[PDB]
Each structure stands twice: as C-alpha cells, then as structure tokens.
Coordinates of C-alpha atoms in Angstrom, one line a residue:
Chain A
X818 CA 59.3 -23.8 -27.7
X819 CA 56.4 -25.3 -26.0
X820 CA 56.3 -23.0 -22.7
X821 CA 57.5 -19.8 -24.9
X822 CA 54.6 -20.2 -27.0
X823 CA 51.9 -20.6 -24.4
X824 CA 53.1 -18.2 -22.5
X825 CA 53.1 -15.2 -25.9
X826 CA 49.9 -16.8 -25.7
X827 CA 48.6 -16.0 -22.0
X828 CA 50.2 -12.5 -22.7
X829 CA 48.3 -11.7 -25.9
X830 CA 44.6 -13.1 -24.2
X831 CA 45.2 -11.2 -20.9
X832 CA 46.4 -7.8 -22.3
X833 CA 43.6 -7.8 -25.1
X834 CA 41.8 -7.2 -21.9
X835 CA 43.7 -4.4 -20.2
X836 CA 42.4 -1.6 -22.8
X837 CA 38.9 -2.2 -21.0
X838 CA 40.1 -2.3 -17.9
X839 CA 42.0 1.0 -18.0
X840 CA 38.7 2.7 -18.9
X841 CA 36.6 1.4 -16.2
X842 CA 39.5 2.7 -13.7
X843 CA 39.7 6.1 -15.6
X844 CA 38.3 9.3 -13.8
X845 CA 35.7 10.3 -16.1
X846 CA 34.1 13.9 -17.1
X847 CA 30.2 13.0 -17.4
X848 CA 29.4 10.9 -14.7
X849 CA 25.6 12.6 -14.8
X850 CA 26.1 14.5 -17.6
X851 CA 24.6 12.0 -19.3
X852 CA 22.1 12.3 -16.2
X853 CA 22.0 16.1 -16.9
X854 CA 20.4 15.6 -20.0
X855 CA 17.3 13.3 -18.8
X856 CA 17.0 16.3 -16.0
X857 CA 17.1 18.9 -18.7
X858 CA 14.9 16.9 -21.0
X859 CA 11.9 16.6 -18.2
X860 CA 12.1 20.0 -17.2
X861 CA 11.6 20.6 -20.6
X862 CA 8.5 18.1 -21.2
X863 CA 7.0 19.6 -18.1
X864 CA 6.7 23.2 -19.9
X865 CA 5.4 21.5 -22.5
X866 CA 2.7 20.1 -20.6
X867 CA 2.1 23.9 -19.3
X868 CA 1.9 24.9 -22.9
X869 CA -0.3 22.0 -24.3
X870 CA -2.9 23.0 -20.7
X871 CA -2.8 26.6 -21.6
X872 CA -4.1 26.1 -25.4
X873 CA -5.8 23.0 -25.1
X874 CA -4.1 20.9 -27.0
X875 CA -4.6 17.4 -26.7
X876 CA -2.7 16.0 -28.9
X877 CA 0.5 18.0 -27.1
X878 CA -0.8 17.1 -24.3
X879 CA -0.9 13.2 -24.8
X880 CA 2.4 13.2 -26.6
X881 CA 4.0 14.9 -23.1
X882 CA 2.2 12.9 -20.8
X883 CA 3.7 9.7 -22.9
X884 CA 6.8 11.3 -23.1
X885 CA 6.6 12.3 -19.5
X886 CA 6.8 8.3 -18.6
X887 CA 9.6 7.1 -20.6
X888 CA 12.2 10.2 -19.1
X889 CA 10.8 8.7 -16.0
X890 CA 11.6 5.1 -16.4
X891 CA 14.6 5.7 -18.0
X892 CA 15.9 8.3 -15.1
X893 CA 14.6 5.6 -12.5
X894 CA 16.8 3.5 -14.2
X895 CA 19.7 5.6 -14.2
X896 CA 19.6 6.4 -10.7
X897 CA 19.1 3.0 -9.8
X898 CA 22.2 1.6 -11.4
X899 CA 25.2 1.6 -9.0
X900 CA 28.5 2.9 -9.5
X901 CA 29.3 -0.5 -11.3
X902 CA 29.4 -1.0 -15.0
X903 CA 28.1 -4.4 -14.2
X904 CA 28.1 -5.8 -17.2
X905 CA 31.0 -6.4 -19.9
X906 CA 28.9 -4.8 -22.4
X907 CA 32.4 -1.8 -21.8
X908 CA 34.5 -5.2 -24.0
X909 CA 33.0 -4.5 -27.3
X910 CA 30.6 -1.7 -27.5
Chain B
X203 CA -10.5 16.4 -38.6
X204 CA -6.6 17.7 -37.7
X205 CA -6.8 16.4 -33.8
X206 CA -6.2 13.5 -35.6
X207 CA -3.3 14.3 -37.7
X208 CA -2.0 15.3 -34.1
X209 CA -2.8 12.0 -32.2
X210 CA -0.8 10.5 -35.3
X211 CA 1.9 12.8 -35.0
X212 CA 1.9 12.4 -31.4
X213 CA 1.8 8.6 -32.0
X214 CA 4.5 8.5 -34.4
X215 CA 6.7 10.5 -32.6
X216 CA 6.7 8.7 -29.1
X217 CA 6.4 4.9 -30.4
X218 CA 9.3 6.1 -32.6
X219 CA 11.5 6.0 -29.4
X220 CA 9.8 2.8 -27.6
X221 CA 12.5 0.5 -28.5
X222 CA 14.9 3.2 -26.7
X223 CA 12.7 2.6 -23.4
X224 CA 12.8 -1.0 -23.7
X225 CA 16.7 -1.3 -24.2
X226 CA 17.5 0.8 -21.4
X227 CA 14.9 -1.4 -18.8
X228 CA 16.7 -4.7 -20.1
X229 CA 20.2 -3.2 -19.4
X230 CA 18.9 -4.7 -15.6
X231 CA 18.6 -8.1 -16.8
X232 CA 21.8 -8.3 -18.2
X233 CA 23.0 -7.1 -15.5
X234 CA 21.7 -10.3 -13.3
X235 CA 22.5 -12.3 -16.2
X236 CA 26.4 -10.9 -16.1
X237 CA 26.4 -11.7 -11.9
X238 CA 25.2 -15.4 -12.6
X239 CA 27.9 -15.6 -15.9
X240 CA 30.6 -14.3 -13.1
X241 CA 30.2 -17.1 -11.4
X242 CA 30.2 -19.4 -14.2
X243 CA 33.9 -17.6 -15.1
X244 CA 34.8 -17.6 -11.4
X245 CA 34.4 -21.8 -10.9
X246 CA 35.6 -22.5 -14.8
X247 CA 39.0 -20.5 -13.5
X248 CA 39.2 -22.4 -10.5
X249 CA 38.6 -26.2 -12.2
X250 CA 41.5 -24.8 -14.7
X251 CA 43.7 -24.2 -11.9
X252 CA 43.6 -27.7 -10.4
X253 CA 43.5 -28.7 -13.9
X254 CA 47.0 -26.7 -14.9
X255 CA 48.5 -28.2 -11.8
X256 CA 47.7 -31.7 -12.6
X257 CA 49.0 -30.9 -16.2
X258 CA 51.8 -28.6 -14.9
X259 CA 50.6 -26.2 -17.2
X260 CA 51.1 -22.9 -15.9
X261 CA 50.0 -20.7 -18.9
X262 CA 46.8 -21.6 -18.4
X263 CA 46.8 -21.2 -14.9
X264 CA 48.3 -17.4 -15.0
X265 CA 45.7 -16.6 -18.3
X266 CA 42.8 -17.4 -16.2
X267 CA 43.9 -15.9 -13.5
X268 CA 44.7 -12.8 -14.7
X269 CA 41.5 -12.9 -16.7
X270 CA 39.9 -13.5 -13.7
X271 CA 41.4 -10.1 -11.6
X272 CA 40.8 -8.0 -15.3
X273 CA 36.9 -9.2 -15.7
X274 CA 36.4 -8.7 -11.4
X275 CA 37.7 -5.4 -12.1
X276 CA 35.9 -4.2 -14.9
X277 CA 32.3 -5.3 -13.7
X278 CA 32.7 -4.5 -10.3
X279 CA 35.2 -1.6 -10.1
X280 CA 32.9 1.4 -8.3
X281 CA 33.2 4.0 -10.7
X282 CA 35.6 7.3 -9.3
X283 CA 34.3 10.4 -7.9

C-alpha cells in the first residue's frame, strides 16, 4: 500500500548505510600501524642517506633526500588528520 | 657516464611514486569539501522535513533523518582508542 511501500523504502536507503557506520564505530587494530610503517620507512631512508654519504654516491644520495620529503609530507599529513574519517570516502572505497 | 644511469634510476624511481604524494595531500581538500557538502545534507534534510510535514509524508521525513544521524556519525565519529 502507499505508506507500506515508502516505508520498505526508507528502510532499504537508511540500512544500506549502517554497514559503514558500524565500521567507523568499530575498535580497530592499526590505528598507527599504518603510521608504523612511514616511521619504519624514514628510519630506513635515513640509513640510506648514511650509506649514500659514506660511498659518495650521488645518485643514492638524491634519490633519499627526494625520498626523504615525500615520507615527510605524507607523515605530516597523517599526524595532522584527526581522529575523524572526515570524509565519506569509508561509503564506497 | 653511469652517474647518469643512476640520476635516471633515481629519477624513475621517486617520480614513480609522485602521484602517491599528491593523492594523500588532496585527501585535505576533500576533507573541506566533505564539511561544506555536510552542510548542504544538513539544510536539504531540514527543507524535507517541513516539506514531509506539509505533505504528511513521513517516510521521507524518518529516511532523511536517519540519514542524517548515520552520515553525522560516520564523518565525525572520533575514532576509539
């Protein structure tokens, strides 16, 4: 009937919904894991470096010191970021 | 001379991932773009409120609503722990 039908209706848009929302709630493992990584990652850039001084290489060297910026950038970013997804980017990828 | 076949290497190797940099810098602006499209949902649920009243159309009324709390919750829910 008319109000049965837009009601199925309201149901089946809302709870497409609630599988996102039940992951943004959930206590999750990695947290700065993710972080852990990027950490990980510049300590090892920053051996690299060491190594590329101690045989004059250059082109090692360069590649680190390049390398050395976007870790940077991208770990300013993380730690920037909030405690908020922010963005409903969670919906569909 | 081989210094060259390393800048190249170290060229190709670092460009490779610019892209990557340059995705994670604009997840800020979509963040500012997702606050100012909140707000857009936000007055869009309200005008459909008055508008199921004056309709008596409550399924819309509760579907927006509900949206509303659902969408609130994912992009502003702090994140546990």
């Amino acid at each position: 009937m008319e109000n049965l039908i837009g009601y199925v209706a309201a149901f089946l848009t809302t709870v497409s919904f609630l599988p996102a929302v039940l992951r943004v709630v959930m206590t999750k493992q990695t947290r700065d894991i993710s972080r852990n990584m990027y950490i990980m990652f510049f300590l090892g850039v920053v051996l690299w470096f060491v190594y590329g001084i101690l045989r004059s290489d250059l082109p090692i060297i360069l590649a680190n010191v390049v390398t050395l910026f976007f870790v940077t950038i991208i770990l300013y970013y993380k730690l920037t970021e909030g405690n908020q997804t922010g963005s409903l980017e969670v919906l569909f990828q």
